A paper describes a structure:
Adenylyl cyclase 9 (AC9) is a membrane-bound enzyme that converts ATP into cAMP. Each membrane AC contains two conserved cytosolic catalytic domains and twelve predicted transmembrane (TM) helices, with cytosolic N- and C-termini of varied lengths and regulatory roles. Here, we present the cryo-EM structures of AC9 in several distinct states: (i) AC9 bound to a nucleotide inhibitor MANT-GTP, (ii) bound to an artificial activator (DARPin C4) and MANT-GTP, (iii) bound to DARPin C4 and a nucleotide analogue ATPαS, (iv) bound to Gαs and MANT-GTP.
In the AC9–Gαs structures, this α4 helix is displaced further, with RMSD values of 3.15 Å in AC91250–Gαs–M and 5.7 Å in AC91250–Gαs–MF. Gαs as a full activator engages C1a and C2a domain simultaneously, whereas DARPin C4 as a partial activator only engages the C2a domain.
Residue numbers in the entry:
A (entry chain A): 320 to 359, 380 to 552, 566 to 574, 1020 to 1250
B (entry chain B): 28 to 65, 88 to 390
Write the structure that this text describes.
């Protein structure tokens, strides 16, 4: 009947929760129906604009785990949604497009779709506002967490890559640069670059903040419906998985501890040296990358990978997890057998890139996979801005496993080695890795010395 | 929006990606096309060609299975002089250097050195430019188009060059071909119309500048097999070329090289009846060029499943009329191909 417009309102909310307002309304002229043919062959289709003169702003909670130590696995999502809701309020106040929340990290761009000339002002002013907001949360809930902020300006190419859990995002050498400069930013004060000071116009309390170890600075102040219900159901199963799609029907928010659960970060090692930006922004390198990520999103659609969830893809990194469909024990099944199938995913996706290396002539991709398992907390972030994501200790431990990983080999965590060892796989002891946040850690790579030795 | 007509004039463009290994003639052929359809550094890189050529000659004189000896060793100092300028990034190109290069180019031990140009890497426009630049020992001459087409400058990255042909747009992509460049190709595999795959047929008895241990033509065949099945190019026709015809002809009629010594399946190879050679064309050379055509067409036989067709031609990129004829035929074929969508 008329309810079709209701379902179209839902689908419009879904779009507006994965892509900026601008391109959300742009995709609401439905002239080119090639995405409509994505809903329903050589190169997968994707759209990526190479936009110059945009700012990037990252911000990580400082001392996050020290706060998330003993929350109720639900109050954590509560306070975190409060924080990012203040942050979104500030985004609209400051006219700057947020992009996503990488676990603890939160980041935005200053007008990539709709350019601006004051974008540096907009960006770092939002940074200062974020400092204010986290300071007020610090003395409102009484939590000892401030957040380090980093800003870098330049050119970024913004678009969508992937088929499963695709989200408007940004990529460059400048994005990664803002990332590291936040990583080198001392808490509470925005850590900016030469590239944004070169037109900051000194209207702020310029403070040349060296690293304690490219001329970075520091600042601190101064009928026909069935198609439509199909499309909306697909976009929703995109943005959030099935079980949460059920639980959210009846509940305002969502949150769930998972005492056992595995997570893998598959990062392509030698992308940034395959990506030569001399061409038209080199967005064709990102086209090849999207063609790759397509093969992992394809892997997801196998039968036996039902329980696997691609949480998101962070640039070249690919972040997957399991142990989320597991809601009841079965008599003839083993509990932690899911860690096998997820692990097999890892192996398979390794194999996948070798297929992509057959179609990649006189160059090879090399992805390192980091594997961990343990406790974690899954949650859903916003209202009218839906964003499924998981935190905990497995997330960061596996990310720092991968980031300390070796390519073409699966770096596994210790207790994961213990559990997997009985399941037939033969690991080889790597030694000891100094994991930021855990000190020395014992690690086991998967292939039994696949190289010579 | 002013973008509708822009997209529709895009859809009316023939994308001609130039592929194929290095020193094959992609840059030469695109220079040819722009000559047929369309500021002083050129003379300088021609002189760089001369210098690099003569240096490669004089250097390899010591590192063959016999060390090549000058028939007039009284010019030995000259050789030493040439070995002294071996790597001088800046150069004035003095007249005494040119006289040195010529006086060496006259010796016949130097000649026997050059004739063995297959056992070491060497540029293909050496013997030409030596003779042709002996004339331009002066300063106030600009070289003709023939000299500009035999100019050997290295290709490093996608060079997008446009041109029009009687109210048909054309946008081709000259590309490098050395091993270090072959990662750059897969950028421009997007909606490309035809893949002019250049090959150096006279490079069957030489080795590549990658490792001096792979037969240039065996390497070209491996690369053709690699891009023939390239899962992004299982729908795009490969308008094969077989460039460097005249060099091939001179090599075969020279009688010094043995293709059967380099490739065993030539002794038991027969001339095919579909031969369409021009009058006064040696049956041995014709059998050879068609043998190479068959070695390239076998790659396009065992696979493909009739989604993409290889349309081999023959060409000499430094023969403007040859490119004119073969590109008219190419224009027919890509008219039939681009519209296939
Ligand atoms: N005799 C003859 N020589 C040719 C012909 N085509 C190319 N050459 C010669 O071969 C050499 C290599 O040509 P070149 O222009 O460098 O190809 P390329 O595509 O640029 O090679 P690269 O840049 O990928 S390494 C040049 O010296 C050129 O003179 C031809 O048809 N006949
Ligand atoms: Mg070239």
């Amino acid at each position: 009947g008329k309810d079709l417009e209701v379902e179209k309102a839902l689908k419009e909310r879904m779009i507006h929760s994965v892509m900026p307002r601008i391109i959300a309304d742009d995709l609401m002229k439905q002239g080119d129906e090639e995405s409509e043919n994505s809903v329903k062959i050589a190169f997968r289709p994707f759209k990526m604009q190479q936009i110059e003169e945009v700012s990037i702003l990252f911000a990580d909670i400082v001392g996050f785990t020290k706060m998330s130590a003993n929350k109720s696995a639900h109050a954590l999502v509560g306070l975190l949604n409060d924080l990012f809701g203040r942050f979104d309020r500030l985004c609209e106040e400051t006219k700057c497009e947020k992009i996503s929340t990488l676990g603890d990290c939160y980041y935005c761009v200053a007008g990539c779709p709709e350019p601006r000339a004051d974008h540096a002002y907009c960006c770092i002013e939002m940074g200062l506002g974020m400092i204010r907001a986290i300071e007020q949360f610090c003395q409102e809930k009484k939590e000892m967490v401030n957040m380090r902020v980093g800003v870098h300006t330049g050119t970024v190419l913004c678009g969508i890559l992937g088929m499963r859990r695709f989200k408007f995002d940004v990529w460059s050498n400048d994005v990664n640069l803002a990332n590291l400069m936040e990583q080198l930013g001392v808490a509470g004060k925005v850590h900016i670059s030469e590239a944004t000071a070169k037109y900051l116009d000194d209207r702020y309390e310029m403070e040349d903040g060296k690293v304690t170890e490219l001329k970075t600075y520091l600042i601190a102040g101064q009928t026909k419906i069935q198609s439509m219900r199909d499309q909306a159901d697909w976009l929703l199963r995109n943005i959030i998985p099935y079980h949460v799609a059920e639980q959210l029907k009846v509940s305002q928010t969502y949150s769930k501890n998972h005492d056992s659960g595995g997570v893998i970060f598959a990062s392509i090692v030698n992308f940034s040296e395959f990506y030569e930006e001399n061409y038209e922004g080199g967005k064709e390198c990102y086209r090849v990358l999207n063609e790759l990520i397509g093969d992992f999103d394809e892997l997801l659609s196998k039968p036996d990978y039902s329980s696997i969830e691609k949480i998101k893809t962070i640039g070249a990194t690919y972040m997957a997890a399991s142990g989320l469909n597991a809601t009841q024990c079965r008599d003839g099944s083993h509990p932690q057998e899911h860690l096998q199938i997820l692990f097999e995913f890892a192996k398979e996706m390794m194999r996948v890139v070798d297929d992509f290396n057959n179609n990649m002539l006189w160059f090879n991709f090399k992805l390192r996979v980091g594997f961990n398992h343990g406790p974690l907390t899954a949650g859903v972030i916003g209202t009218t801005k839906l964003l499924y994501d998981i935190w905990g200790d497995t997330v960061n431990i596996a990310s720092r496993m991968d980031t300390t990983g070796v390519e073409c080999r699966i770096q596994v965590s210790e207790e994961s080695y213990r559990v997997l060892s009985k399941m037939g796989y033969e690991f080889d002891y790597r030694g000891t890795v100094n994991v930021k946040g855990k000190g020395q850690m014992k690690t086991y790579l998967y292939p039994k010395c696949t190289d010579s030795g | 929006k002013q973008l509708q007509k822009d997209k529709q004039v895009y859809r009316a463009t023939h994308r001609l990606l130039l592929l194929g290994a290095g020193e094959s003639g992609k840059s030469t052929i695109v220079k040819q096309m722009r000559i047929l359809h369309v500021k002083a550094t050129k003379v300088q890189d021609i002189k760089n060609n001369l210098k690099e050529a003569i240096e490669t000659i004089v250097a390899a004189m010591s590192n063959l299975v016999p060390p090549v000896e000058l028939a007039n060793p009284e010019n030995q100092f000259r050789v030493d002089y040439i070995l002294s300028v071996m790597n001088v990034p800046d150069f004035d190109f003095p007249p005494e250097f040119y006289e040195h290069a010529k006086a060496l180019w006259e010796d016949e031990g130097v000649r026997a050195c050059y004739e063995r140009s297959n056992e070491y890497q060497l540029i293909d426009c050496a013997q030409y430019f030596l003779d042709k630049i002996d004339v331009i020992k002066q300063d106030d001459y600009v070289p003709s188009d023939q000299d500009l087409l035999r100019c050997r400058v290295l290709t490093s990255g996608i060079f997008e060059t446009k041109f029009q042909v009687d109210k048909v747009n054309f946008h081709m992509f000259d590309v490098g071909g050395q091993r270090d460049e072959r990662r750059k190709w897969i950028q421009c595999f997007n909606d490309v119309t035809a893949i002019i795959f250049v090959v150096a047929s006279s490079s069957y008895n030489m080795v590549i500048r990658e490792d001096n241990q792979t037969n240039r033509l065996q390497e070209a065949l491996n690369l053709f097999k690699s891009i023939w099945n390239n899962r992004w190019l299982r729908t795009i026709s490969v308008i094969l070329f077989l460039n460097k015809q005249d060099l091939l002809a001179e090599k075969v009629l020279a009688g010094k090289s043995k293709i059967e010594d380099y490739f065993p399946e030539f002794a038991r190879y027969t001339t095919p009846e579909d031969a369409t050679p021009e009058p006064g064309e040696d049956p041995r050379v014709t059998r050879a060029k068609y043998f190479i055509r068959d070695e390239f067409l076998r790659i396009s036989t065992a696979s493909g499943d009739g989604r993409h067709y290889c349309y081999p031609h023959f060409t000499c990129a430094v023969d403007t009329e040859n490119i004119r004829r073969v590109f008219n035929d190419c224009r027919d074929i890509i008219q039939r191909m681009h519209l296939r969508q």
